[PDB]
């Protein structure tokens, strides 16, 4: 249908993920929930914690059912543990339905909730394969498609910055909202249904090819992850990219620690030298054999605005490309300014330029193709 009612249903603080409002339990208890395409568990704070403004109260819900088993979930650096159960859940600015869903009641955690955050739980939107304790714990979105009869698809339009900066965007559950993107939507295959795994076939920095065996770009996987902030790149790819961006931007010289994500670079306000930083093009495998298309990243996307309240007049930024030993993550920084369709029903992810994009006087983020290729299924790791 029209998805008018779901537009602008997402909020957030920069670097602390995007969240949607949800209700859990009878009568409904409202919580803000992190939207995470990089995990498969729906979990909510359900005991006091110094950084939680609210938490789920099982005893106040006539529909809670305890599953009498616990669950522990470690992420990249944060973790939680809790009791599993089920309860009735809905999304007030999503479709007007109620699903009985698995819920992990978080009763202890480590480096998970963030001070000042606004969210109280997390909604892992990926596949059952990566769910904890194991794949028999049906993820929230599988429940929603099974029980209500919504098409097996959602899309995400993460809009970036309009006190840390406020962000917003839209999560369209059950379809594609044509007013949230411009131009053509290009699909890449979901390689394997676990994370949302895709295949990158070529990387360019300022039109200049990185010239690596394309297997290195997906070593040992590449995923689309709304729950990670940065572009994360395997060791070798990272070093080659950081070299290419150093050279195209060599007129100014920056600390070791800038490029390690350890230190801000600051410029007197309004003096940010955008034009010395290159654009980055990631070509992704197409649906048609021997075709690819590319998405193009501006420096405005990979240099994250971050404020020092002291030197209060400057514009400061953190480098939001960073080194991985667990594969490529196309995180928030890559998804912002694009409209991303998690087409689960047809095992593909589409990209299109977003209605809320990040244009420059001279350069523009884009989604373009086709470009003819070969040995693209060779770019996958085994
Ligand atoms: C930053 C971060 O962790 N974000 C989380 C969500 C998240 C957001 C937050 F604000 C605080 C957190 F503690 C966790 C993502 O969900 C990470 N997604 C993938 C990225 C990457 C994959 C390997 C490429 O590495 C791992 C490692 C573990 C897990 C969790 C499960 C094992 C249970 C699936 C997920 C992932």
Swiss-Prot record:
Enzyme class: hydrolase
Positions carrying N6-acetyllysine: 69, 211, 215, 221, 235-236, 243
GO biological process: amyloid fibril formation; amyloid precursor protein catabolic process; amyloid-beta formation; amyloid-beta metabolic process; cellular response to amyloid-beta; cellular response to copper ion; cellular response to manganese ion; detection of mechanical stimulus involved in sensory perception of pain
Annotated ranges, domain Peptidase A1: 18-352
Glycosites: 96, 115, 290
Upregulation: Up-regulated by the Ca(2+)-regulated transcription factor NFATC4.
Active site: 36, 225
Protein's cellular compartments: Cell membrane; Golgi apparatus, trans-Golgi network; Endoplasmic reticulum; Endosome
Extracellular side: 1-382
Disulfide-linked positions: 159-356, 214-379, 266-316
Swiss-Prot/TrEMBL catalytic activity: Broad endopeptidase specificity. Cleaves Glu-Val-Asn-Leu-|-Asp-Ala-Glu-Phe in the Swedish variant of Alzheimer's amyloid precursor protein
Molecular function in Gene Ontology: amyloid-beta binding; aspartic-type endopeptidase activity; beta-aspartyl-peptidase activity; endopeptidase activity; enzyme binding; peptidase activity; protein serine/threonine kinase binding
One of the record's GO cellular component terms: endosome
Subunit annotation: Monomer. Interacts with RTN1; RTN2; RTN3 and RTN4; the interaction leads to inhibition of amyloid precursor protein processing. Interacts with SNX6. Interacts with PCSK9. Interacts with NAT8 and NAT8B. Interacts with BIN1. Interacts (via extracellular domain) with ADAM10 (via extracellular domain). Interacts with SORL1; this interaction may affect binding with APP and hence reduce APP cleavage. Interacts with NRDC AND NRG1.
Domain notes: DXXLL motif is required for a proper endocytosis and retrograde transport to the trans-Golgi network, as well as for regulation of lysosomal degradation. The transmembrane domain is necessary for its activity. It determines its late Golgi localization and access to its substrate, APP.
Role according to the record: Responsible for the proteolytic processing of the amyloid precursor protein (APP). Cleaves at the N-terminus of the A-beta peptide sequence, between residues 671 and 672 of APP, leads to the generation and extracellular release of beta-cleaved soluble APP, and a corresponding cell-associated C-terminal fragment which is later released by gamma-secretase. Cleaves CHL1.
Protein name per the record: Beta-secretase 1
Lineage: Eukaryota, Metazoa, Chordata, Craniata, Vertebrata
């Amino acid at each position: 249908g029209s998805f008018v009612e779901m537009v602008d249903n997402l909020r957030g603080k920069s670097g602390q993920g995007y969240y949607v409002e949800m209700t859990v339990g009878s009568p409904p208890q409202t919580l803000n929930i992190l939207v995470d395409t990089g995990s498969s568990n729906f979990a909510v704070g359900a005991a006091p914690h110094p950084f939680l403004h609210r938490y789920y109260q099982r005893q106040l819900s006539s529909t809670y059912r305890d599953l009498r088993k616990g669950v522990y979930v470690p992420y990249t650096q944060g973790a939680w543990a809790g009791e599993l159960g089920t309860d009735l859940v809905s999304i007030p600015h999503g479709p007007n339905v109620t699903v009985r869903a698995n819920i992990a009641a978080i009763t202890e955690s480590d480096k998970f909730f963030i001070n000042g955050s606004n969210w109280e739980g997390i909604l892992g939107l990926a596949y059952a394969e990566i769910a904890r304790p194991d794949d028999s714990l049906e993820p929230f979105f599988d429940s929603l498609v099974k029980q209500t009869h919504v098409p097996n698809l959602f899309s995400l339009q993460l809009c970036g910055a309009g006190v840390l900066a406020s962000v917003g965007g839209s999560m369209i559950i059950g379809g594609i909202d044509h007013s949230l993107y411009t131009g053509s939507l290009w699909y890449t295959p979901i390689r394997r249904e676990w994370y949302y795994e895709v295949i990158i076939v070529r990387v360019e920095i300022n039109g200049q090819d990185l010239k690596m065996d394309c297997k290195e770009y997906n070593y040992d996987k590449s995923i689309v992850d709304s729950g990670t902030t940065n572009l994360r790149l395997p060791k070798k790819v990272f070093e080659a990219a950081v070299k290419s961006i150093k050279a195209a931007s060599s007129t100014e010289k920056f600390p070791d620690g800038f490029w390690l994500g350890e230190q801000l670079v600051c410029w007197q306000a309004g003096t940010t030298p955008w034009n010395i930083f290159p654009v980055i093009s990631l070509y992704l495998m197409g649906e048609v054999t021997n075709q690819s298309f590319r998405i193009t990243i501006l420096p405005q996307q990979y240099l994250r605005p971050v404020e020092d309240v002291a030197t209060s007049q400057d514009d400061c930024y953190k480098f939001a490309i960073s080194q991985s030993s667990t594969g490529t993550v196309m995180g928030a920084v890559i998804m912002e300014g694009f409209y991303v369709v998690f087409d689960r029903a047809r095992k593909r992810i589409g990209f299109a330029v977003s209605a809320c994009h990040v244009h420059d006087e001279f350069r523009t983020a884009a989604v373009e193709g086709p470009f003819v290729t070969l040995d693209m299924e060779d770019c996958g790791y085994n």
